[PDB]
Amino acid sequence: QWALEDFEIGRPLGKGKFGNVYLAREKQSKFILALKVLFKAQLEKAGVEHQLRREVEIQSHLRHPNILRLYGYFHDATRVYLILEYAPLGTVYRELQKLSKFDEQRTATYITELANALSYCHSKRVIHRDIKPENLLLGSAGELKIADFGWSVHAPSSRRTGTLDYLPPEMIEGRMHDEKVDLWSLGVLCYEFLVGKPPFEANTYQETYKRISRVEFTFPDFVTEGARDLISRLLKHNPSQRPMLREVLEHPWITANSS
Ligand SMILES: Nc1ncnc2c1ncn2[C@@H]1O[C@H](COP(=O)(O)OP(=O)(O)O)[C@@H](O)[C@H]1O
Ligand SMILES: Cc1c(C(=O)O)cc(-c2ccc(Cl)cc2)c2cc[nH]c12
Numbered sequence: 726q727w728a729l730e731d732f733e734i735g736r737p738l739g740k741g742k743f744g745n746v747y748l749a750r751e752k753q754s755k756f757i758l759a760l761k762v763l764f765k766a767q768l769e770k771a772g773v774e775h776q777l778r779r780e781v782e783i784q785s786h787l788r789h790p791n792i793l794r795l796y797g798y799f800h801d802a803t804r805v806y807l808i809l810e811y812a813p814l815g816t817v818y819r820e821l822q823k824l825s826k827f828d829e830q831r832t833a834t835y836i837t838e839l840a841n842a843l844s845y846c847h848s849k850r851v852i853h854r855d856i857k858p859e860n861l862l863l864g865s866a867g868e869l870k871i872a873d874f875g876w877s878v879h880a881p882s883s884r885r886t887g888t889l890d891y892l893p894p895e896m897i898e899g900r901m902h903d904e905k906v907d908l909w910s911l912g913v914l915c916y917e918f919l920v921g922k923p924p925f926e927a928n929t930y931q932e933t934y935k936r937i938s939r940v941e942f943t944f945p946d947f948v949t950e951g952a953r954d955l956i957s958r959l960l961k962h963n964p965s966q967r968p969m970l971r972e973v974l975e976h977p978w979i980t981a982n983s984s
C-alpha cells in the first residue's frame with residue numbers, strides 16, 4: 726500500500742484526459758517513476774471508473790520490454806494514482822513533430838517493437854485499442870514502449886467509447902471487434918511514421934469517419950513499394966483480411982529495414 730506522502734513530485738510529463746502525469750521519486754529507494762494522477766469527480770462524471778480498474782488490472786499483469794510497466798496504484802479522497810515506469814525519452818508523437826517524418830529504418834524498427842509487444846498482448850487476448858503516437862513512449866535506449874491502457878479490453882469486445890484517426894471501421898461503427906483492431910492501428914502508424922500524418926486525416930470528425938469507412942487513402946510518391954505493400958495489407962476494411970503479427974514481422978520490407 727502506497728500513499729502520496731511516499732513520493733517527491735517533479736515536473737509534469739504530459740496532460741491526460743482525466744488529469745496529468747508527473748515525474749516522481751519514491752523517497753526510501755530514490756526510484757524515479759511516473760505518477761498518472763486522475764480526478765475522482767471526472768472519472769465518476771464520465772462513468773469510466775470500471776474501465777480505470779481494467780486499465781490497472783490489464784497493464785499490471787503485462788511483462789514485456791516493449792510494454793510500459795504499471796507497478797501499482799493508490800487513491801485518496803479526490804484522486805486515483807497510477808505508478809508507472811518512467812519513459813525518459815518521451816513520446817513518439819514529440820519525435821515525429823520535430824523530425825516531420827521517420828526514415829524507413831527507424832519506421833521498420835518501431836513497427837517491429839510494436840508487433841512484438843502486440844503479439845505478446847494478443848497472446849493474452851488483450852486489445853489495446855488506443856495505439857497512437859502520443860501513447861508510444863521511449864526508453865533510455867530509444868526503444869518503443871506501448872503505454873496508456875486506458876481503453877484496453879479482452880477480445881472479443883462490443884464495448885463502445887475522437888480523433889478517429891487510429892480507429893478501425895468496426896470500432897467506428899460500434900460493431901463487435903477483436904485483436905484485428907491493433908493490426909489496423911499498426912498500418913495507420915506505419916503510414917504516419919513515413920508520411921508525417923495519418924492516412925485518414927481531415928479537418929472534421931465527419932470527413933475522417935467517411936475516409937476510414939471507405940478505406941479512402943493515397944500514398945505520396947516517396948513511399949516505397951515495400952512500405953505501400955505492408956500498409957495496404959494492414960488497412961483492410963475486413964478484419965479477417967488483416968495479416969497475423971507473425972506475417973508483419975516476416976514482411977520483406979520489415980526484415981530489410983529493421984532494425
Ligand atoms: N511513464 C511515462 N513517462 C513519460 N511520459 C509519460 C508517461 N506516461 C505518460 N506520459 C506522458 O503523459 C501523457 C498522458 O499520459 P497517458 O497515460 O497516455 O494518459 P491519457 O490516458 O490521459 O491519454 C502521454 O501522452 C505522455 O506525453
Ligand atoms: C470513489 C472512488 C473509489 C473509492 O473510494 O472506492 C475508487 C475509485 C478507483 C480507485 C482505483 C481504481 Cl484502479 C479505479 C477506481 C474511484 C474512481 C472514481 N471514484 C472512485
Ligand SMILES: O=C(O)[C@@H]1CCCC[C@H]1C(=O)O
Pocket residue numbers: 741742743744763773774776777780873874875876
Ligand atoms: O486512464 C485514463 O485517463 C482513463 C481511464 C478510464 C477510461 C479512459 C482512460 C483514458 O482516457 O485513457
Ligand SMILES: [Mg+2]
Pocket residue numbers: 859860873
Ligand atoms: Mg494517452
Ligand SMILES: [Mg+2]
Pocket residue numbers: 855873874875876
Ligand atoms: Mg488513455
